[PDB]
Each structure stands twice: as C-alpha cells, then as structure tokens.
Amino acid sequence: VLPLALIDDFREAYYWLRMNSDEDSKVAAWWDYGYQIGGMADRTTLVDNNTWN
Amino acid sequence: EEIKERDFYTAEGEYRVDARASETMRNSLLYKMSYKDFPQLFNGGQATDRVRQQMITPLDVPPLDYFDEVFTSENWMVRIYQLKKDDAQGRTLRDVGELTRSSTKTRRSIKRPELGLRV
Amino acid sequence: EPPATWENVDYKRTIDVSNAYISETIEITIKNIEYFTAFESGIFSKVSFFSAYFTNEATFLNSQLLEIRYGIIQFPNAISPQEEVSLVIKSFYNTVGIPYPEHVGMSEEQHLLWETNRLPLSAYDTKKASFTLIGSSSFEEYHPPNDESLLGKANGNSFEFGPWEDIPRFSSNETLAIVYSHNAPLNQVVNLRRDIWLSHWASTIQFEEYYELTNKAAKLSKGFSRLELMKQIQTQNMRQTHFVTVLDMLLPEGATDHYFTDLVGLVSTSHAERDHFFIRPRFPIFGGWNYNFTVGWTNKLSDFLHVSSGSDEKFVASIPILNGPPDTVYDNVELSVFLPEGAEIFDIDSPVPFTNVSIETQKSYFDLNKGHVKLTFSYRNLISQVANGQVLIKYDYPKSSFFKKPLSIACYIFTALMGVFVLKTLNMNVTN
Amino acid sequence: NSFYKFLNWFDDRTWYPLGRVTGGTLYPGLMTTSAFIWHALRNWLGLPIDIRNVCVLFAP
Amino acid sequence: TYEQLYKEFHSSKSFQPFIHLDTQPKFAICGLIVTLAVLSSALFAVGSKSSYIKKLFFYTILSVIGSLFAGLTTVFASNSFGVY
Numbered sequence: 250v251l252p253l254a255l256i257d258d259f260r261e262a263y264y265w266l267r268m269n270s271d272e273d274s275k276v277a278a279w280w281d282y283g284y285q286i287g288g289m290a291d292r293t294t295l296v297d298n299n300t301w302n
Numbered sequence: 303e304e305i306k307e308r309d310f311y312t313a314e315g316e317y318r319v320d321a322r323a324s325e326t327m328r329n330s331l332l333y334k335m336s337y338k339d340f341p342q343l344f345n346g347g348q349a350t351d352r353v354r355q356q357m358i359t360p361l362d363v364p365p366l367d368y369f370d371e372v373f374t375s376e377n378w379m380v381r382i383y384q385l386k387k388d389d390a391q392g393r394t395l396r397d398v399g400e401l402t403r404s405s406t407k408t409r410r411s412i413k414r415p416e417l418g419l420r421v
Numbered sequence: 422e423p424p425a426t427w428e429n430v431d432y433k434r435t436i437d438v439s440n441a442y443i444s445e446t447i448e449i450t451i452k453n454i455e456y457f458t459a460f461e462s463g464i465f466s467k468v469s470f471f472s473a474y475f476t477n478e479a480t481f482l483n484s485q486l487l488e489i490r491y492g493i494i495q496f497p498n499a500i501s502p503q504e505e506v507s508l509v510i511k512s513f514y515n516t517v518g519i520p521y522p523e524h525v526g527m528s529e530e531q532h533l534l535w536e537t538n539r540l541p542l543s544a545y546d547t548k549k550a551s552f553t554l555i556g557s558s559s560f561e562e563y564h565p566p567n568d569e570s571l572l573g574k575a576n577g578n579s580f581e582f583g584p585w586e587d588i589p590r591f592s593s594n595e596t597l598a599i600v601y602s603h604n605a606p607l608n609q610v611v612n613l614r615r616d617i618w619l620s621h622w623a624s625t626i627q628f629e630e631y632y633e634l635t636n637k638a639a640k641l642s643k644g645f646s647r648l649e650l651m652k653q654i655q656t657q658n659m660r661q662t663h664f665v666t667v668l669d670m671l672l673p674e675g676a677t678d679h680y681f682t683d684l685v686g687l688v689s690t691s692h693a694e695r696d697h698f699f700i701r702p703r704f705p706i707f708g709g710w711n712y713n714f715t716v717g718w719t720n721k722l723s724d725f726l727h728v729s730s731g732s733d734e735k736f737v738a739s740i741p742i743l744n745g746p747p748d749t750v751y752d753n754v755e756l757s758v759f760l761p762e763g764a765e766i767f768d769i770d771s772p773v774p775f776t777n778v779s780i781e782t783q784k785s786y787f788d789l790n791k792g793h794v795k796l797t798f799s800y801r802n803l804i805s806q807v808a809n810g811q812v813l814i815k816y817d818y819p820k821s822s823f824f825k826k827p828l829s830i831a832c833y834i835f836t837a838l839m840g841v842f843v844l845k846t847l848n849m850n851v852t853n
Numbered sequence: 854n855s856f857y858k859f860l861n862w863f864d865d866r867t868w869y870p871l872g873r874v875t876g877g878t879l880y881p882g883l884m885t886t887s888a889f890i891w892h893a894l895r896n897w898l899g900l901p902i903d904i905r906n907v908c909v910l911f912a913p
Numbered sequence: 914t915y916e917q918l919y920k921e922f923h924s925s926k927s928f929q930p931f932i933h934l935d936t937q938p939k940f941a942i943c944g945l946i947v948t949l950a951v952l953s954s955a956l957f958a959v960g961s962k963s964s965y966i967k968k969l970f971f972y973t974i975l976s977v978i979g980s981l982f983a984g985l986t987t988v989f990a991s992n993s994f995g996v997y
C-alpha cells in the first residue's frame with residue numbers, strides 16, 4: 250500500500266485476475282513481481298525473484 | 303545481432319521519451335503499452351509525464367494491433383493486455399487492422415502482383 | 422395427472438416486470454360444479470412463493486405444491502353446489518429474460534426478451550379471459566402473428582389484450598415473446614453462507630456472511646477503457662446505468678462493530694449510517710464479472726432471546742433470516758446456528774419449506790470437549806423482500822453446564838502444575 | 854496435507870515450461886517450526902487460529 | 914406447530930445477564946493480581962524444607978486455589994478483547 254491520502258491500486262488488478270480469468274492461464278511480467286502474482290493473484294508465471302535459470 | 307543499445311539513444315546520445323525520440327524506441331513493445339491513451343486524457347491534447355518531466359503529443363504513440371487492453375486500474379498504475387487470437391483466414395494481423403482502421407486509399411490498380419510459384 | 426370438476430367465469434392475469442423477479446397476480450371467480458391450479462413445466466422449479474386470499478378477508482388459505490404439474494388450494498369450511506366464490510392468487514418467479522442485443526456498449530438502454538403463453542392454461546372451462554402487462558415504459562412484440570384478433574394494444578404505460586369469450590378446456594399451444602426496456606444491474610448471488618454465534622456468558626450475538634455475487638446483464642462490445650468511464654463520472658445526470666457501484670444492506674436496530682473484509686485483504690471504503698451500511702467493491706461489476714466478499718457485525722442478546730415464563734432453564738430464540746441488499750435473488754442459501762456448549766434441542770420450525778436439516782458439533786476458542794452444538798439447514802430459490810420471516814428454536818441450558826467452562830480451564834492448569842512438582846523433585850544425579 | 858508430501862514437492866506453477874523442484878532448492882526450518890506451533894495451538898492448548906496470523910506474528 | 918412457539922415467544926420476558934459486559938475489565942485486573950500472588954507463593958515453597966508431606970500438602974492446596982482463580986481470570990479476560 251502506497252500512502253494525505255491512500256493509493257490502493259496494486260491489489261485491484263491481482264484480484265481482478267483471480268476472479269475473472271480461467272484457472273490455467275499464464276502471466277508474463279518482469280521478474281521483480283513474480284512472487285506476488287503467484288501468491289496473491291494465484292496464476293502460473295514465467296519468471297520470479299529466484300533468477301535460477 | 304538482433305538487439306543493440308546503440309539505437310535507443312537519440313542523436314548525440316541522450317535517453318528521452320519526447321517528440322524527438324528514436325525511431326526504434328517509438329516502435330518498441332514496452333513504449334506502446336505504457337503511453338497508449340495518455341495524450342487523450344488531459345485537456346487540450348498535451349500531457350506531462352510527472353517523472354521524466356517531458357511533454358507528449360497524440361501523434362507520438364502509434365496503435366498496436368496484436369494485443370488489446372482488458373483492465374486498467376484507477377490511477378493508471380497497472381495495465382493488463384491480452385494476446386489477440388490468430389486470424390481465421392491466414393491474414394497477417396497488421397493487414398486486417400490497416401484495412402479496418404483506414405477506409406481511405408481507394409483505387410482501381412489493375413496490375414498483376416509479384417508472387418512466387420505455388421508449390 | 423388427475424383433474425377435477427369446477428367452472429370459472431373470469432380470469433385476470435397481470436404480470437408485473439419491474440425488478441429482478443417476475444411477479445404476477447390473478448383474480449378468479451369460480452362458481453359451482455379441493456381446487457387445483459396448473460403450471461407449465463420448467464416454471465415449476467423456479468417458483469419461489471405461493472399464496473391464496475379471500476377477496477375481502479385478511480386470512481391465508483393453506484396451499485402447497487405437488488408434464489404439467491399442479492398446486493393445491495384447500496377451503497376452510499365446506500363447498501356447496503350452486504354457489505360461487507372469488508379469490509386472488511399471487512406468485513413470484515425467478516426469471517428475468519435475456520438481454521436481446523448481447524453486446525450493448527457503455528451507456529445505452531438495454532432491452533430484455535421474455536416468452537410465455539398467451540391463452541390461459543388452467544384445466545377448466547373459461548368464460549372470459551383478459552391479460553394485462555404492467556411494468557416498464559417501452560414494450561414491443563417480437564415475431565407477431567397474422568391474426569388481428571390477438572394482437573395487443575397499448576395505453577397508459579401498460580398493455581391490454583382481448584376479452585376472448587370462449588376458451589376450450591385445456592389448450593396452451595400458442596406463444597408470445599415481448600421485448601421490454603430495463604435499466605438496473607439485476608444481480609444475483611450464486612450461494613450464501615451465513616452463520617450466527619450465540620455466546621451466552623457475555624451477551625452479544627454476532628453475524629457473519631459470505632456473498633458470492635455475480636451480474637446478469639449485457640456485456641461490453643470492445644474491451645474496458647478507463648477514460649471513457651472517467652468521462653461518465655465527470656458528467657453525471659442519471660442513475661440509469663447498468664453496472665453496480667455502491668450497494669447497501671439493511672441491518673438490525675442497534676449494530677455495533679462493523680467490518681467489510683474481502684478474500685485478499687480488508688477493503689477500507691465503507692461507512693455507516695443510522696441503520697444502513699454502504700459498501701463499495703474494488704472494481705465496478707460490468708455484467709460477466711464476479712465478486713466474492715464477507716460482511717459481519719454484532720448486536721445484543723436481550724432482544725433476540727426470551728427465557729420461558731414458568732421456568733428458568735428453557736429459552737426460545739427467534740432469528741431473522743436473509744437481511745441483505747434491497748433487490749437481489751438468492752439461488753441457494755444455507756443457515757447455520759451455533760448454540761453454546763452442552764445444550765439440548767427440543768423443536769425447530771420455520772415458515773418456509775427447508776430442504777434439509779442437520780445437527781453436528783464444532784470446536785472453538787477455549788473449548789476443550791465435544792464442541793459447540795451446530796445446527797445447519799438449507800433453502801433454495803428465495804427472494805429479498807418477500808421471504809424474510811423468522812426461525813424459531815427452543816432449547817434448554819442448565820445451571821450445571823453454565824459453570825463448566827472455568828472448571829475446564831482450571832482443571833488443565835491444575836493438571837499442569839503437578840508435572841512441574843513431579844519433574845522438580847526427582848533424583849537425577851550420577852554421583853553419590 | 855502431510856509432511857511427506859512437502860520434502861519432495863514438484864510445483865508446475867513457476868518457471869512454466871520447466872518447473873522447479875523445491876525440496877532441493879529451499880531451506881526448511883522456517884516452515885516446519887511454524888507448522889509445529891500451529892499443530893500445538895490447535896490440538897493441545899485448545900484455541901484454533903489461522904495460519905496467516907501465525908505467519909504474521911512469528912517475529913515479535 | 915409454528916403457532917404454539919409464536920404465541921409462546923411473545924408471552925415471555927427478556928433476558929437478564931449474569932454480569933454486565935462493562936464491568937468485566939475490573940474483575941480481570943482484580944483477578945490477575947490475586948492469581949499471581951497465590952500461584953507465586955505456591956511455586957515458591959517447592960524449595961528445601963526437607964519435609965515431604967507438608968510440602969506436598971501446602972503445594973497442593975495453593976495450587977488448587979491458584980487454578981480456580983486462573984479460570985475465572987481467563988474467562989473475564991477474554992470477553993474484553995473481542996473474542997467471546
């Protein structure tokens with residue numbers, strides 16, 4: 250959450266993607282946000298913060 | 303060979319996003335997806351970038367054909383695009399978008415095209 | 422399929438289509454030679470209410486249900502030949518019709534298409550039969566027939582139909598299809614799960630919900646553009662739009678500790694009124710979208726529970742069921758009441774048929790044997806403001822088991838000190 | 854589910870065309886003392902609480 | 914069936930609780946002192962008296978009193994946090 254007022258527009262679009270998308274569907278974002286998309290939006294990413302391969 | 307960072311810089315080596323950006327920066331895939339409807343938002347047809355502190359005019363961003371916008375959040379912080387499914391007749395997805403988007407350039411043009419042999 | 426012998430002289434249907442449920446009344450006047458009524462199949466597993474009056478009384482004749490299926494009306498005293506009687510009948514379905522241009526756009530009127538039969542269906546000889554159709558402001562008929570005698574004629578924001586002097590005993594082979602104009606989200610929950618904790622040491626009752634709601638309206642043609650919605654918010658003159666932005670449930674009288682959580686966190690855009698509770702989703706629901714959330718609050722026991730008169734260990738509880746948004750239609754809703762520990766149950770009743778009933782147990786905080794008594798029971802197809810009712814449970818709760826909670830904690834502490842006593846005074850030296 | 858299904862666990866929701874094998878790529882010990890505290894509060898002391906509240910209040 | 918219960922519901926009187934809800938945070942801190950005194954003196958006498966019978970006697974009695982005040986302490990101390 251990013252604070253004279255609130256800015257909560259970073260959890261709208263993970264819960265959109267949890268409610269309104271079919272359950273086997275791949276998301277392709279840059280590797281900084283890999284853990285949050287898998288944890289909070291619950292889909293199957295292509296990269297994450299491990300930088301293994 | 304395919305990608306080189308000598309091309310995203312302007313003349314005499316400055317990185318910027320303005321109306322004098324590069325020719326291969328304006329045609330990239332992460333430029334078109336960020337500044338899509340950003341000049342049509344503000345009044346008069348001009349906009350401030352608020353971070354880079356540069357000014358954008360609605361002729362500087364071309365339209366994309368192969369993707370389409372599905373959800374865009376409140377303060378324009380996360381934007382979600384979707385791959386458009388392939389064309390059911392073999393046509394390239396740039397040509398159908400150019401056919402729909404530009405109903406001008408009518409002509410007769412009776413000339414035989416230059417094709418290869420049907421094998 | 423057994424019929425009987427009767428005869429009616431009037432028949433006045435008037436379908437009202439003004440909410441997310443289609444509500445009609447008929448006024449019949451049946452004369453001489455217990456009374457049956459007939460339903461088209463497919464509109465029998467959507468019926469959600471049934472009733473019968475006398476034309477001037479304030480009573481309610483009893484009635485129930487059970488390929489044309491039937492329903493039964495009784496009579497309070499008797500029936501006599503060469504005698505007429507007039508009655509009305511109300512009914513509430515669970516159908517709305519489908520949006521006829523499927524992909525509307527953003528800010529347009531939406532139209533609905535609904536189809537039924539034109540002539541009456543009842544198994545008896547009809548003398549005169551009218552048909553009226555009140556509700557929306559713009560009606561039209563879809564695929565009209567060629568015969569002039571059964572078209573409809575409009576006046577005063579309603580339709581009218583022909584008086585139609587002779588109708589045979591049993592014939593329903595003629596249809597219609599109306600397109601009307603509607604402006605509302607017209608949402609429905611898919612299932613609900615409400616549960617009621619009924620603590621007794623401290624007084625309070627507390628309620629929890631779990632709404633899984635969706636929207637049945639017309640989808641968007643081209644995507645979802647944000648700035649066009651900003652242009653709608655900038656210049657506002659109407660509430661005629663078909664997506665939902667706020668919604669408000671009505672609460673009991675003095676409610677204390679509200680919260681509006683979610684499945685991903687805790688949404689913080691919600692403020693109370695004297696009796697209402699206005700909530701807002703994270704994103705506006707546009708007609709094929711879903712939203713799953715959770716509301717809860719708390720009250721006082723001293724107006725939901727009455728101790729019996731000639732005793733001190735018999736209690737009677739009466740719980741409201743289904744207090745929610747003002748216009749919504751619930752498909753299946755299941756209730757669950759958690760009585761306090763070590764109670765026994767005598768009888769349970771409700772004014773609405775209750776498909777199943779079950780009694781189990783469930784453990785909770787500082788609960789060290791056998792759990793709370795949970796009793797759960799289910800419903801199906803019931804609407805907001807027409808099926809509210811109460812539910813009555815009678816139970817007993819002795820003074821013996823009222824004092825067993827601190828003795829259970831105290832017996833675990835007492836059996837925890839003796840282990841330190843035995844462990845502390847015991848020889849473990851290896852030298853002499 | 855069980856502790857036997859966690860030591861050798863192949864998840865196919867990360868690095869998608871070639872999923873990662875977790876049991877030889879992470880350090881157990883932060884998870885298993887937490888499942889131990891959950892198993893002790895739920896069965897012995899008598900009070901059931903959620904796994905999210907055990908995970909938030911694990912450092913203080 | 915419904916009418917006997919429904920006329921038996923309006924024929925009754927309301928519910929009077931045993932201890933009002935705004936009083937219990939006084940009994941909480943008024944219990945937490947006494948149980949710490951009694952239970953502390955219970956575990957204090959486990960030292961070397963070198964007399965087994967009177968040590969088991971005093972320890973058992975003060976453990977009983979400390980237990981029966983710790984129970985009421987945690988029941989009243991749980992209703993004033995918001996978990997009933």
Ligand SMILES: CCCCCCCCCCCCCC(=O)O[C@H](COC(=O)CCCCCCCCCC)COP(=O)(O)OCC[N+](C)(C)C
Binds near residue numbers: 849851852
């Ligand atoms: C990894 C840890 C697991 C240990 C399991 C056993 C736990 C024993 C805990 C002992 C508690 C302390 C009390 C103690 O001092 O006992 C030890 C105790 O001395 C010993 O260590 C002997 C214990 C083992 C007994 C041998 C049987 C084999 C055990 C099964 C494998 C003996 O030392 P002391 O006899 O006290 O030393 C001399 C006496 N002074 C007065 C000088 C102190």
Ligand SMILES: CCCCCCCCCCCCCC(=O)O[C@H](COC(=O)CCCCCCCCCC)COP(=O)(O)OCC[N+](C)(C)C
Binds near residue numbers: 855886892
């Ligand atoms: C001097 C020598 C001292 C030796 C000290 C040994 C202390 C270890 C005591 C551990 C007690 C475990 C008790 C237990 O069974 O709790 C379980 C399982 O709980 C766990 O997941 C954590 C236990 C994992 C054990 C780790 C291997 C043993 C490491 C110490 C030898 C709860 O986990 P659950 O995830 O709920 O399910 C586990 C699988 N079941 C079969 C049980 C369904």
Ligand SMILES: CCCCCCCCCCCCCC(=O)O[C@H](COC(=O)CCCCCCCCCC)COP(=O)(O)OCC[N+](C)(C)C
Binds near residue numbers: 627900902
């Ligand atoms: C001498 C006293 C003995 C010990 C006192 C016992 C403390 C009581 C708390 C027990 C654990 C409660 C954990 C908890 O989840 O509480 C939170 C609400 O969260 C809270 O408010 C808990 C705050 C507790 C503060 C604890 C202070 C430190 C105590 C350590 C000794 C409520 O969440 P829910 O369980 O979701 O409540 C609604 C669900 N109902 C079933 C009740 C309808």
Ligand SMILES: CCCCCCCCCCCCCC(=O)O[C@H](COC(=O)CCCCCCCCCC)COP(=O)(O)OCC[N+](C)(C)C
Binds near residue numbers: 941942993
């Ligand atoms: C080992 C030492 C560990 C110490 C840890 C210290 C932690 C400090 C931070 C604690 C967090 C505060 C918890 C908390 O939220 O308590 C508040 C307000 O609660 C109260 O009203 C105070 C009641 C205190 C009762 C005394 C209990 C003593 C026993 C505890 C071990 C709850 O009150 P409210 O939020 O107002 O809930 C309203 C419920 N009513 C029934 C009153 C309407």
Ligand SMILES: *[C@@H]1O[C@H](CO)[C@@H](O[C@@H]2O[C@H](CO)[C@@H](O[C@@H]3O[C@H](CO)[C@@H](O)[C@H](O)[C@@H]3O)[C@H](O)[C@H]2NC(C)=O)[C@H](O)[C@H]1NC(C)=O
Binds near residue numbers: 611612711713
């Ligand atoms: C949020 O609420 C919805 C609405 O109830 C929940 O959806 C439920 O589960 C599935 C989707 O997970 C819905 O579709 C079903 O999918 C299965 C696939 O196995 C298919 O076989 C079924 O025929 C059906 O199409 C289902 O309709 C729906 N309702 C139920 C089961 O009653 C969803 O689970 C909720 N929670 C989220 C998104 O976290």
